[PDB]
Design an enzyme around this catalytic site. Sequence first.
Site, PDB file in Angstrom:
ATOM      1  N   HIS A  35      39.389  14.717  -6.883  1.00 19.90           N
ATOM      2  CA  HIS A  35      40.575  15.567  -7.048  1.00 19.90           C
ATOM      3  C   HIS A  35      41.174  15.372  -8.446  1.00 19.90           C
ATOM      4  O   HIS A  35      41.382  16.341  -9.173  1.00 19.90           O
ATOM      5  CB  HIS A  35      41.623  15.266  -5.977  1.00 19.90           C
ATOM      6  CG  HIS A  35      42.945  15.913  -6.236  1.00 19.90           C
ATOM      7  ND1 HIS A  35      43.090  17.279  -6.392  1.00 19.90           N
ATOM      8  CD2 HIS A  35      44.175  15.380  -6.420  1.00 19.90           C
ATOM      9  CE1 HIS A  35      44.361  17.557  -6.625  1.00 19.90           C
ATOM     10  NE2 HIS A  35      45.040  16.426  -6.659  1.00 19.90           N
ATOM     11  N   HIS A  63      47.680  11.325 -11.757  1.00 18.72           N
ATOM     12  CA  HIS A  63      48.869  11.833 -11.058  1.00 18.72           C
ATOM     13  C   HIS A  63      48.868  11.540  -9.561  1.00 18.72           C
ATOM     14  O   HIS A  63      49.910  11.687  -8.947  1.00 18.72           O
ATOM     15  CB  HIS A  63      49.019  13.337 -11.263  1.00 18.72           C
ATOM     16  CG  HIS A  63      48.153  14.147 -10.356  1.00 18.72           C
ATOM     17  ND1 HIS A  63      46.815  14.380 -10.601  1.00 18.72           N
ATOM     18  CD2 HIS A  63      48.432  14.746  -9.177  1.00 18.72           C
ATOM     19  CE1 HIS A  63      46.305  15.085  -9.601  1.00 18.72           C
ATOM     20  NE2 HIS A  63      47.273  15.356  -8.739  1.00 18.72           N
ATOM     21  N   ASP A  64      47.721  11.155  -8.978  1.00 17.63           N
ATOM     22  CA  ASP A  64      47.659  10.793  -7.557  1.00 17.63           C
ATOM     23  C   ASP A  64      47.102   9.366  -7.354  1.00 17.63           C
ATOM     24  O   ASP A  64      46.624   9.028  -6.275  1.00 17.63           O
ATOM     25  CB  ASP A  64      46.806  11.813  -6.761  1.00 17.63           C
ATOM     26  CG  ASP A  64      47.610  13.040  -6.301  1.00 17.63           C
ATOM     27  OD1 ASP A  64      48.813  12.912  -5.979  1.00 17.63           O
ATOM     28  OD2 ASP A  64      46.999  14.119  -6.183  1.00 17.63           O
ATOM     29  N   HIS A 109      42.691  13.378  -1.466  1.00 16.27           N
ATOM     30  CA  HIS A 109      43.354  12.727  -2.601  1.00 16.27           C
ATOM     31  C   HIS A 109      42.596  11.536  -3.172  1.00 16.27           C
ATOM     32  O   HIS A 109      43.066  10.399  -3.137  1.00 16.27           O
ATOM     33  CB  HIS A 109      44.785  12.342  -2.209  1.00 16.27           C
ATOM     34  CG  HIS A 109      45.718  13.521  -2.180  1.00 16.27           C
ATOM     35  ND1 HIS A 109      46.207  14.065  -1.009  1.00 16.27           N
ATOM     36  CD2 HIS A 109      46.218  14.281  -3.185  1.00 16.27           C
ATOM     37  CE1 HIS A 109      46.988  15.092  -1.299  1.00 16.27           C
ATOM     38  NE2 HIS A 109      47.004  15.250  -2.611  1.00 16.27           N
ATOM     39  N   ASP A 153      47.072  20.987 -10.499  1.00 15.71           N
ATOM     40  CA  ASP A 153      47.042  20.357  -9.176  1.00 15.71           C
ATOM     41  C   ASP A 153      46.487  21.309  -8.105  1.00 15.71           C
ATOM     42  O   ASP A 153      45.807  20.864  -7.190  1.00 15.71           O
ATOM     43  CB  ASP A 153      48.454  19.886  -8.807  1.00 15.71           C
ATOM     44  CG  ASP A 153      48.464  18.621  -7.949  1.00 15.71           C
ATOM     45  OD1 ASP A 153      47.385  18.081  -7.592  1.00 15.71           O
ATOM     46  OD2 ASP A 153      49.594  18.161  -7.656  1.00 15.71           O
TER      47      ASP A 153
HETATM   48  C1  LIG Z   1      54.233  21.001   2.806  1.00  8.97           C
HETATM   49  N1  LIG Z   1      52.934  21.558   2.545  1.00  8.97           N
HETATM   50  C2  LIG Z   1      52.047  20.851   1.771  1.00  8.97           C
HETATM   51  O1  LIG Z   1      52.248  19.771   1.237  1.00  8.97           O
HETATM   52  C3  LIG Z   1      50.773  21.540   1.587  1.00  8.97           C
HETATM   53  C4  LIG Z   1      50.336  22.448   2.530  1.00  8.97           C
HETATM   54  C5  LIG Z   1      49.129  23.079   2.327  1.00  8.97           C
HETATM   55  C6  LIG Z   1      48.364  22.819   1.203  1.00  8.97           C
HETATM   56  N2  LIG Z   1      47.149  23.492   1.058  1.00  8.97           N
HETATM   57  C7  LIG Z   1      46.422  23.266   0.013  1.00  8.97           C
HETATM   58  C8  LIG Z   1      45.110  23.955  -0.205  1.00  8.97           C
HETATM   59  C9  LIG Z   1      46.848  22.338  -0.976  1.00  8.97           C
HETATM   60  N3  LIG Z   1      46.246  21.995  -2.094  1.00  8.97           N
HETATM   61  N4  LIG Z   1      47.034  21.047  -2.685  1.00  8.97           N
HETATM   62  C10 LIG Z   1      48.092  20.844  -1.928  1.00  8.97           C
HETATM   63  C11 LIG Z   1      49.038  19.807  -2.260  1.00  8.97           C
HETATM   64  C12 LIG Z   1      49.780  19.896  -3.415  1.00  8.97           C
HETATM   65  C13 LIG Z   1      50.650  18.882  -3.753  1.00  8.97           C
HETATM   66  C14 LIG Z   1      50.765  17.766  -2.962  1.00  8.97           C
HETATM   67  C15 LIG Z   1      50.021  17.661  -1.812  1.00  8.97           C
HETATM   68  C16 LIG Z   1      49.158  18.676  -1.474  1.00  8.97           C
HETATM   69 CL1  LIG Z   1      48.263  18.477  -0.012  1.00  8.97          CL
HETATM   70  N5  LIG Z   1      48.015  21.655  -0.818  1.00  8.97           N
HETATM   71  C17 LIG Z   1      48.833  21.897   0.292  1.00  8.97           C
HETATM   72  C18 LIG Z   1      50.034  21.250   0.466  1.00  8.97           C
HETATM   73 MG   LIG Z   2      50.324  14.173  -5.526  1.00  9.62          MG
HETATM   74 ZN   LIG Z   3      47.132  16.094  -6.774  1.00 11.65          ZN
END
Ligand SMILES: CNC(=O)c1ccc2nc(C)c3nnc(-c4ccccc4Cl)n3c2c1
Ligand SMILES: [Mg+2]
Ligand SMILES: [Zn+2]
Length: 342
Positions: free
Chosen positions: A85, A121-122, A81, A233
């Site tokens: 990103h 956004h982050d 993050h 995202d």
């Molecule tokens: C409860 N599970 C997760 O929050 C979670 C699990 C596996 C992920 N795997 C990937 C590749 C990913 N990419 N963006 C996000 C992501 C999107 C929005 C906010 C935070 C994140 Cl980290 N994620 C994942 C998120």
């Molecule tokens: Mg976020």
């Molecule tokens: Zn993000």
Amino acid sequence: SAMDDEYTKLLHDGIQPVAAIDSNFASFTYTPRSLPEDDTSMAILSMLQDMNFINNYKIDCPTLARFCLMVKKGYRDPPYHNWMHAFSVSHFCYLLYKNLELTNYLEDIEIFALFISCMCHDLDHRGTNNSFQVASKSVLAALYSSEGSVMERHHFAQAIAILNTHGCNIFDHFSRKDYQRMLDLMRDIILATDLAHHLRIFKDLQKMAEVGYDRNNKQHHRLLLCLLMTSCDLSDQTKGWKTTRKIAELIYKEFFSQGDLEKAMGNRPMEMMDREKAYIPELQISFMEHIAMPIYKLLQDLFPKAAELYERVASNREHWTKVSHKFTIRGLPSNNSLDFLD
Ligand SMILES: CNC(=O)c1ccc2nc(C)c3nnc(-c4ccccc4Cl)n3c2c1
Ligand SMILES: [Mg+2]
Ligand SMILES: [Zn+2]
């Protein structure tokens, strides 16, 4: 001072043509993470120019240059993050603009808000999730836990704090109405990046896709902005296997660091944040099947030209299945030693 010289060049040197960044810069196949980080603020300006927002909204170039650098500076450096990103998410927004004819669906100001929201956004992410804020009794939880989406509220508040910094309000010549509209859009779009919000509106997204987008329906506009934001995202999943693999490494580095902190606090982390329990190929296949693929399927349902995105995510998902066996140690380890059993 560093920002001052960077600013001086960004403002006075001129905005580089977007084609000069990369010949395939406006293609779904392009990986924006390939761009050197030192080139990214100029690339933001180039994209804003190419989308006609600088001209259309008469954005003050000194203010815009300052704003872009302040947003970049507003990201810390956790494994995932970070500014690269936000940059890659913003780039995907630009791709959606260049490839999907968003102007048939959304107002100009909505597309502009989407892009600025992507950049922001982050902001000031600390590499930990919303649950951790509450568990660790952070300042952010003290502020926002009664409302939910703690981090996302903080990201929005940080965006506003940047705008409220002298010399940085790219919108301050807007009419009162338009300024209010822009900041409200930024609220909705940034809060939409909480995956809990996405899951809550998913059935509404499905319904919209199935009845057909109505550009005269204000709720459809809102829903589409949320879906597009989420699509930006998660857009690392729409590139090649190498990108999905690297981003898995970054995400789990970040997750596991949080899990380590949770254990030290006497708390049991989520399985996916516990480096002793997390089995990455299964966790990534679940994420892809349960979250990412349905998002890009909806996107395809609304925009037939987005089909290649869904097919790419599906392909990358299959590749996780194909490489899973490699997480099982066959034969002896690298060093011919079973010492790790102790
Ligand atoms: C409860 N599970 C997760 O929050 C979670 C699990 C596996 C992920 N795997 C990937 C590749 C990913 N990419 N963006 C996000 C992501 C999107 C929005 C906010 C935070 C994140 Cl980290 N994620 C994942 C998120
Ligand atoms: Mg976020
Ligand atoms: Zn993000």
